[PDB]
Amino acid sequence: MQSGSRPHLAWQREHMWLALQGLGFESGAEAANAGKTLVHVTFGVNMFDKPNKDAFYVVFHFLFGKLDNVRCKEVFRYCWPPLDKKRDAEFRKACCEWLKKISDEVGAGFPQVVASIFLSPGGPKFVHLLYHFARYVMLQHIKRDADAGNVFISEALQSKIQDPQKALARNKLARQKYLKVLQKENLVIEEYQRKA
Amino acid sequence: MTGGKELGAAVELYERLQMLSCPCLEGVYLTDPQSIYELLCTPSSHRLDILQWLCSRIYPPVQEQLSSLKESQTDTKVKEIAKLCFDLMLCHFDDLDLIRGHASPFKQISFIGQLLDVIQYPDTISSNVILESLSHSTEKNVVTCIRENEELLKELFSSPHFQATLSPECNPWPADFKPLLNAEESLQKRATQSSKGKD
Amino acid sequence: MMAANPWSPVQPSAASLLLEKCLAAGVLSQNALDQAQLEAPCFSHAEELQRITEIK
Amino acid sequence: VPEDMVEMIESQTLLLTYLTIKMQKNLFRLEEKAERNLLLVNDQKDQLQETIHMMK
């Protein structure tokens, strides 16, 4: 009856990590920005299996930064980096307020943001919240970076496909498009070097 | 005036379509690149049959949905195709002109090209296997794709060169050319104006 | 470990090194890459100026 | 198909698409800078060639 730990949260941890990397997350550079040395902070796929306060500071500041760098500097001016008990409480309060706004704006597709989740950042509920936060940041990037004619791509990705066959086809197309651009990049660099 | 490049791309697409034994091309042998272009990129009932075919190949359940619609309802067919294509991230849901064939030739070629990419998607390794059973459940194919994709992504992100591909930099020029390359906005205008065709 | 001949005028691009790595891991097949080959011409305006200089 | 598999594929599609758009934007900027540099150098070549011919 008796209440079997839903296998559902393991792959979300992995794809979250891929998303951070894809956004340009560098463990050494971002840790240094938070005044912490790499010897004491564990980054990776399992970084929030146990409550990890240090990683929480770094990753969230990074994602907010990637979302709105100007707003990020303004909202955290007086509490970044969280060095004392007073600053820490302010940083958490700020993260919760900002994410609550995002959660209100996006509606039923974004997890409910409760203040208790930030007291001990760790666990499946926390990872689930961070993944959807990372996903949101990527979609904003696709919307910004997508040319006036491809803005529809961000809308299409937001529209949840419930049919597995349709999702597969869409993925195949995306994979191909990536391989093409990767090949083009090689060609342009080669040709430029030769001509020069 | 459909430039020489669009006609060549249309021909390529036409060849790919032939290779995929598209039933709509049965008894139609076009050797003239312009005829091939008019077939693929101008509004016609045939073009719509081809697109319908391409879409039925990518997503088979759509075929039952389209076949139930009477010939007098052509506008509704076009809207259903646009909706699928939107779900595949290829065009906007109101881009009806692209489906009708009124969009720019390049846009049309690129569009049909992408559809074909999906159909000709090298099905990896295992598939020597021939005839057998139709019946295989949609569920086994999805599991395989996920697995493969996971391996690709893992490899892509484990690589030290991955970050460099996201922001490619290349400077092949020696130091002695730097002054030429940093030179005043006026030299740049002279160099770009000299390339205009009448010369 | 195909030791990049230091004397090749064309240094391998990050894209190339990544593609090579993907092919070595069997995650990508050369057939898949070939089917994806874009013949898009690079630097068309520079080429036209070269031809005009020769005729002159 | 467990509602959970369709969500994973969509997440993969999102990652690839993001990478693709990010790469394409940065590649176009390089191509434009490269072609400009080639044209500038080609123009210098053309001036030297004309002067040599006149002297000859």
Side-chain angles (χ1 to χ4, degrees):
Chain A
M1 268 180 107
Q2 277 196 356
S3 103
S5 171
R6 261 181 181 183
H8 286 299
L9 249 104
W11 67 268
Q12 286 181 1
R13 62 181 182 173
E14 286 181 2
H15 285 196
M16 179 212 65
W17 178 243
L18 292 176
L20 288 173
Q21 289 182 322
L23 287 165
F25 187 81
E26 280 181 2
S27 43
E30 294 303 336
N33 256 355
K36 303 283 184 184
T37 341
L38 253 125
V39 180
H40 292 78
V41 183
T42 45
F43 295 106
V45 177
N46 300 329
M47 70 182 71
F48 292 110
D49 286 356
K50 297 182 181 179
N52 192 346
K53 190 180 173 180
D54 292 332
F56 163 71
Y57 298 150
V58 178
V59 172
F60 267 67
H61 186 269
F62 171 78
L63 288 174
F64 280 120
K66 287 295 181 182
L67 187 68
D68 192 340
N69 191 28
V70 177
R71 188 173 175 175
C72 182
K73 288 182 182 177
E74 279 180 359
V75 173
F76 297 116
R77 184 175 189 165
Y78 300 107
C79 56
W80 178 261
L83 299 166
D84 52 314
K85 277 185 184 178
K86 191 179 175 181
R87 288 185 182 197
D88 179 71
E90 276 183 359
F91 182 82
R92 294 183 183 219
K93 191 179 176 179
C95 287
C96 189
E97 284 178 358
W98 197 346
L99 270 153
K100 265 180 185 176
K101 278 182 185 178
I102 295 174
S103 178
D104 292 341
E105 281 179 3
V106 181
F110 199 87
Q112 208 176 355
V113 181
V114 235
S116 61
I117 293 173
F118 296 100
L119 282 149
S120 185
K125 288 183 183 179
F126 184 83
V127 172
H128 186 64
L129 177 70
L130 181 56
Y131 169 78
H132 280 289
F133 184 36
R135 189 178 157 188
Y136 178 79
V137 175
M138 282 185 82
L139 283 167
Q140 289 303 332
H141 275 238
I142 292 174
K143 192 176 177 179
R144 198 178 62 180
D145 290 342
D147 294 340
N150 282 347
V151 176
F152 67 90
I153 296 175
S154 174
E155 293 174 8
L157 282 165
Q158 275 172 6
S159 180
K160 270 181 184 180
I161 299 172
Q162 292 186 349
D163 185 4
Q165 209 169 352
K166 211 174 210 178
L168 182 64
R170 184 177 187 172
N171 183 266
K172 286 182 178 179
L173 235 128
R175 186 176 172 121
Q176 201 167 359
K177 281 185 180 179
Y178 177 78
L179 290 174
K180 281 184 180 179
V181 172
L182 193 64
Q183 287 180 319
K184 185 175 180 179
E185 184 180 342
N186 187 43
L187 188 125
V188 170
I189 290 179
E190 278 185 351
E191 269 219 346
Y192 182 47
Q193 290 178 338
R194 207 183 280 158
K195 287 188 177 196
Chain B
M1 278 215 282
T2 15
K5 271 184 183 180
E6 294 171 356
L7 282 151
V11 173
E12 196 183 350
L13 290 176
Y14 182 78
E15 286 176 356
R16 289 180 68 183
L17 283 161
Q18 273 182 359
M19 282 228 144
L20 287 160
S21 303
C22 178
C24 301
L25 295 169
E26 264 181 2
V28 186
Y29 283 94
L30 298 157
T31 340
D32 181 59
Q34 192 66 8
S35 303
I36 296 174
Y37 172 84
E38 285 176 3
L39 178 70
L40 294 173
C41 297
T42 41
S44 78
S45 62
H46 214 2
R47 172 185 178 126
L48 215 99
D49 289 338
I50 295 172
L51 288 175
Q52 189 174 352
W53 178 81
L54 287 169
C55 288
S56 297
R57 285 289 194 169
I58 297 173
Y59 186 67
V62 170
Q63 184 72 17
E64 285 180 1
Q65 282 179 352
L66 285 139
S67 305
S68 75
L69 294 164
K70 294 185 181 180
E71 241 165 5
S72 60
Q73 295 177 325
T74 329
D75 278 338
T76 313
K77 281 184 184 180
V78 173
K79 282 182 185 177
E80 286 297 327
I81 293 176
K83 189 178 176 180
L84 178 64
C85 290
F86 174 78
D87 289 341
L88 296 174
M89 298 189 293
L90 293 170
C91 64
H92 198 285
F93 71 91
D94 289 339
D95 213 350
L96 301 176
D97 286 340
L98 180 66
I99 303 269
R100 287 183 184 140
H102 290 84
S104 75
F106 265 104
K107 199 176 176 182
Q108 293 189 42
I109 292 171
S110 181
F111 172 72
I112 295 172
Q114 290 180 38
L115 287 169
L116 285 169
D117 287 344
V118 176
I119 298 173
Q120 293 174 345
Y121 190 84
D123 279 340
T124 328
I125 297 171
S126 278
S127 6
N128 257 343
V129 182
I130 298 177
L131 269 149
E132 272 184 358
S133 57
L134 258 112
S135 256
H136 281 332
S137 155
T138 357
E139 240 172 2
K140 279 185 183 180
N141 287 351
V142 173
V143 176
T144 306
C145 186
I146 291 174
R147 185 181 59 84
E148 290 177 356
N149 282 342
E150 267 289 335
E151 289 178 0
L152 177 70
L153 287 171
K154 275 182 186 177
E155 283 300 338
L156 290 173
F157 280 86
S158 300
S159 172
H161 305 297
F162 174 72
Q163 281 299 338
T165 48
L166 294 172
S167 304
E169 293 183 356
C170 179
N171 190 8
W173 305 101
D176 48 329
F177 281 82
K178 213 173 178 179
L180 256 143
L181 294 167
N182 288 343
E184 263 178 2
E185 230 177 358
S186 58
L187 279 171
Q188 272 180 351
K189 274 184 184 179
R190 200 180 206 177
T192 340
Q193 279 183 344
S194 87
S195 81
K196 280 186 182 181
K198 259 180 183 177
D199 273 348
Chain C
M1 249 186 181
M2 270 193 84
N5 198 352
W7 305 96
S8 176
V10 180
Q11 300 294 332
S13 73
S16 177
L17 291 169
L18 205 101
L19 284 169
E20 280 180 1
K21 190 175 177 178
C22 288
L23 283 165
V27 288
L28 244 125
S29 73
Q30 192 63 29
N31 267 353
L33 282 165
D34 290 340
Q35 266 177 358
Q37 233 174 359
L38 267 130
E39 272 187 357
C42 304
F43 309 122
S44 55
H45 289 89
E47 276 185 357
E48 196 175 3
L49 192 82
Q50 191 175 1
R51 282 187 189 172
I52 292 173
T53 312
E54 286 170 7
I55 292 173
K56 282 183 180 178
Chain D
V1 182
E3 220 171 3
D4 273 354
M5 289 183 89
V6 176
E7 204 174 357
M8 189 170 176
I9 284 174
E10 280 291 313
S11 177
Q12 292 172 339
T13 304
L14 177 67
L15 284 165
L16 286 169
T17 309
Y18 175 78
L19 295 175
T20 303
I21 292 176
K22 189 172 181 175
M23 286 180 70
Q24 202 163 4
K25 184 182 173 180
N26 290 329
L27 183 63
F28 184 82
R29 194 176 71 154
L30 177 71
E31 194 176 2
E32 202 185 340
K33 186 179 175 180
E35 190 166 23
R36 277 184 204 200
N37 290 342
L38 287 171
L39 288 170
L40 283 168
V41 177
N42 213 30
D43 190 57
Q44 184 67 12
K45 181 191 165 177
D46 195 24
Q47 286 181 6
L48 252 116
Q49 192 171 352
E50 200 116 14
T51 307
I52 288 175
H53 178 72
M54 289 302 288
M55 291 178 77
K56 283 183 180 177

